[PDB]
Paper text:
Here, we report higher resolution (3.4–3.8 Å) structures of P-gp bound to a series of rationally engineered selenium-labelled cyclopeptide compounds that were designed to probe the ligand-binding pocket of P-gp. The R groups of this series were systematically varied to generate alanine-, valine-, leucine- and phenylalanine-derived compounds (QZ-Ala, QZ-Val, QZ-Leu and QZ-Phe, respectively) of increasing R-group size and hydrophobicity. All four compounds also prevented P-gp-mediated export of the anticancer drug colchicine and sensitized CR1R12 cells in a dose-dependent manner. Fitting the data to the Hill equation gave Hill coefficients of >1 in each case, suggesting positive cooperativity for their binding to at least two sites. In previous structures of apo mouse P-gp, and also for ligands pertaining to subset B, TM4 adopts a mostly straight-helical conformation characterized by weaker electron density, indicative of regional flexibility. Here, we only demonstrate two distinct changes in TM4 (kinked or straight helical) caused by two different subsets of ligands. In doing so, we reveal how drug substrates (i) may enter the transporter, (ii) bind at multiple, shared yet discrete sites in the transmembrane domain (TMD) and (iii) might transmit this information to the NBDs to stimulate ATP hydrolysis. Together, these new structures provide snapshots of how structurally similar ligands, differing only in side-chain R-group size, can bind prior to drug efflux.
The transporter P-glycoprotein (P-gp; ABCB1; EC 3.6.3.44) is expressed in the intestines, liver, kidney and blood–brain barrier, and affects the bioavailability, pharmacokinetics and efficacy of drugs. P-gp belongs to a superfamily of ATP-binding cassette (ABC) transporters found throughout all kingdoms of life. The transporter consists of two pseudosymmetric halves encoded into a single polypeptide. Each half is formed by six transmembrane helices (TMs) and one cytosolic nucleotide-binding domain (NBD) along with interconnecting loops and short helices.
Numbering used by the authors:
A (entry chain B): 1 to 6
B (entry chain A): 30 to 626, 689 to 1278
Amino acid sequence: XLXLXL
Amino acid sequence: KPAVSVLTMFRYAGWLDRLYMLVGTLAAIIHGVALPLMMLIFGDMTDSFASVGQVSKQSTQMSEADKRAMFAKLEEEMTTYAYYYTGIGAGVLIVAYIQVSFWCLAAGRQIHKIRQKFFHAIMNQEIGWFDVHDVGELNTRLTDDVSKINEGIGDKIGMFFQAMATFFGGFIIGFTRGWKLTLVILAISPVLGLSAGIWAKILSSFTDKELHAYAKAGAVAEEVLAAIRTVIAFGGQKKELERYNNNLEEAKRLGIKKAITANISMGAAFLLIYASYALAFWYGTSLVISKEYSIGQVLTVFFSVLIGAFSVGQASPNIEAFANARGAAYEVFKIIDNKPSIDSFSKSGHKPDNIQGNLEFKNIHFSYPSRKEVQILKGLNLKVKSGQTVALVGNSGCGKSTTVQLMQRLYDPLDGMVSIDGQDIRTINVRYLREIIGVVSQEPVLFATTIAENIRYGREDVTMDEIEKAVKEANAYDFIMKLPHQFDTLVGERGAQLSGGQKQRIAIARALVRNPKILLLDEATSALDTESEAVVQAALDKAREGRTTIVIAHRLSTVRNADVIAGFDGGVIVEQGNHDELMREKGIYFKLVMTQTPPASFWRILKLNSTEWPYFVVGIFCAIINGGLQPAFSVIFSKVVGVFTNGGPPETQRQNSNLFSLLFLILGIISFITFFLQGFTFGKAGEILTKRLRYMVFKSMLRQDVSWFDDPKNTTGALTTRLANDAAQVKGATGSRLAVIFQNIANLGTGIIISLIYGWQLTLLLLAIVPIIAIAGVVEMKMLSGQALKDKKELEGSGKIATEAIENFRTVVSLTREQKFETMYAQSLQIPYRNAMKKAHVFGITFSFTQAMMYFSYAACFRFGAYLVTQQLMTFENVLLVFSAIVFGAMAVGQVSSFAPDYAKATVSASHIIRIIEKTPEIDSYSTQGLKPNMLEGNVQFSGVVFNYPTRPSIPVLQGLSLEVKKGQTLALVGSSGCGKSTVVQLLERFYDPMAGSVFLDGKEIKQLNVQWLRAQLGIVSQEPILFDCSIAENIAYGDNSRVVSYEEIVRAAKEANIHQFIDSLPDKYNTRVGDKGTQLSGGQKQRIAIARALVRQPHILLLDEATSALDTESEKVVQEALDKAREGRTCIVIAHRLSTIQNADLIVVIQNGKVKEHGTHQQLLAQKGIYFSMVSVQAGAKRSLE
């Protein structure tokens, strides 16, 4: 959700 | 630049406002702290599943036994955590609402006061202050700056403190849960900073090079399109198209290089981000295997720290928002804090009774605020007795008006004093002074409201009776009563535009209601029709007789009855007395007396891109693999924490986290390959079609005829702009955006497939929640724009009454009643004020609802994730996977909404670019059709021609014009004026086919004749010849295309044109550059070069259009000599304005109103007496004068 994938 | 003291800015905040700000910023800081606490619990949840996850897999013996303790631990723990989350939700709801509502409230409450105080401050300024300032800038300054301030003192502050609160709150948990990882992150923090800087430096490079790159083509396009008639005449269209195509060819190469580098860089940045975070997490695991940290703690500090880290960046924009507001407030508070000398809002000074109105001006020196540059009044002395009427006269400088200007105390004089009655004007109250003085000005102004109201601006307290008597005493009653609506009739700039005299009369009525003791009339009679002048004059004469008066005008009809007349010279009073005395004086007065006695949306643009079947499939397949690659990181991060959470026996863990962390990076590097690809393929694909479009557009733009190029709709700049923009815009749609969209739908697709196939009814649950909060997100923004648009409409009405007030101000100050505009401004403001109160209420609810929904969503996530799903055999590692996958997929879908306008704009831009191609002319030069006659010798038959220019089909240039000129003889064409002479040349070139009539050359109609071949036989020479930038040999060689002209040939042409003196003199000689890029020349040379260009073609028809027009002295002689040598071997038509040089011509023809009037050889037209004799006789007079 930050930038990788969460 | 300039800011304001932080405390001064808030000066209008007191009591409830400061309270609102306190509770608001408090609640904001709480709201800020709220989030990182959410990630703190997220670690505790992980530990709960981790403890069970380990014990569950550690057994491998008993099953049922694990159905008891584990489920109980999960029961109590998950219930606790869910309870907490549900707890946080209400909190963020409340604090969010409080924050936004309170801060918006304070903002509104203040801005109201700011506006009122500011406008008052505007109205309170003395005229000397207006004289030195722009009123437009000032009103715009009001309307814009107050808004800036509002943006600054608004909820942005709350967001700022909330952000700082997330920052501190994030780093605090980050540190306290553990110190190491933080410090380890704060190292890659700069590393991240360096890559962003590099990327910025790369963006700055190509911006400049791109401007340089296309300007190479744009320069060609501009000189060509500006030269369009010369390239059309000489038919070099193919060449110009070739050049443009070459420049495009270069541009695209620079474009693909651009793309390559940009893509490499982006990929590299992405790689560094991947590497750094993967590395940090690996270090995390390396710390967990030591049993130094908990698997959940790592997550807690990682997420908390990154949250806090990004908080800064997210915080920064509100700083600038507050910072600008201080600055906007500076110049705003500067007016409010400014106390004038004059005031007039002050209650002070004597308000005398029984004023007998004796005025005097004593030794007054004055200058307007142009200051030392000019002093208009040097000394002065004047008296006007009570009841008398003095009339001021003067030649210029309007030192006359200055006295009217000073008598109202609009200014205080530099030295001297103006005295009404015995007292100094400065002792008596300003308002009262403005009230005892009536004023009538040259240009009367009427505020927009009923006539009564305009007469009511004389005095607030009045009855329709007084209005009636007022207008009747001004004799305006009749004219207005005949008007509909009676006294309720509208006036203003908008609607009911009336006669100047009537308006003036209404102004005299308005002034009359004022019942002034002192009357000032400045050129009220002047600048008006003579008939109504007497009508208004009667009123003016009736406006007196109760009062003492100073009058100024240029009308000496009105001066005679005056008791005293006063002349001025250089600001110095000289002559004074009765008329007869001034006439006996025979001075200035006597002197002046004697002196005065198409939409669309379609893919054919894409079908053009279909030229490349490849370069797309590659990019999309690549971008879809990228889209398939994107969630794979989620799957890893799930199983890294997942296997570690599901680890069971620890021995096997440390080996796997190394296998994942490796792979974690492996998807990174492979991302570099794909991301660069899809970027490069789309890029190179972009730059090529950009060539095809600009090429097809430009080409088809050289197809269009002169009729299209004269259009005011199409000019060189507009064409170049339309040429650049559309092609530039279609690139953006067909470019990166599409790739990204495919990448994102692919991303969410693979994501949702994974999430769906793993989680059962988990995904189904989420897909119910996610769209609702998304749509709930979108509906908010709609209300925001709605309230925004509505508010703009309400203050526009208040700004409209402000503009009316400060534009006509010098009138309102004279009538006083500024307090009127104050009140009206206030009432106008009152409505937006109540609207701004509702705004806070709404902004809060909408915001908080969108926070609470996201937090409450997060509760149902783990509550359904746990309990029903985890009481089942479904696992935490999958939950963690689904959330990541899904939510990121959505956050990828966001870019779809973000990229929406590009296609619209590109479509509007793609609409024109097809139309401009598909448009065909009446006369196209590209048609290979036409006769191409084999017979050389030319004639020209003009027979019954009628012509109107397509741009201006009003005044016809040609009507039934008919001419004949045999071969090898000069046709001289004389005319009164206009293009009637030139239209011949323009039509023979066939820039236009005439409305009616016809024109032949060899006896064949040029209309059915080939256009190019036709133009190919023509020797056109215009007034100011345009030469393109290139060798003068190339300029001369332009005379003939489809073939290269020999050197000795252009030499012969240059020898014929007598330009050879210049060409052999230059260092570069024939290779010398001309056209202002490399060299400068005078008219003579350029013209001789145009002659060479003309006759290198060896035309059978020379056309000389006013060739000597701009030229002088011997230049005319030598150029005329050249032109004279040029003709006599060819048919030609000479319209030149020097008739003395036409004196030798085979046939002279005078044109009149489009019909040939006079005809025949010089001595014949000279034998006859008529127009041509007058043409030649009149221009001989100038020569005789010069002699």
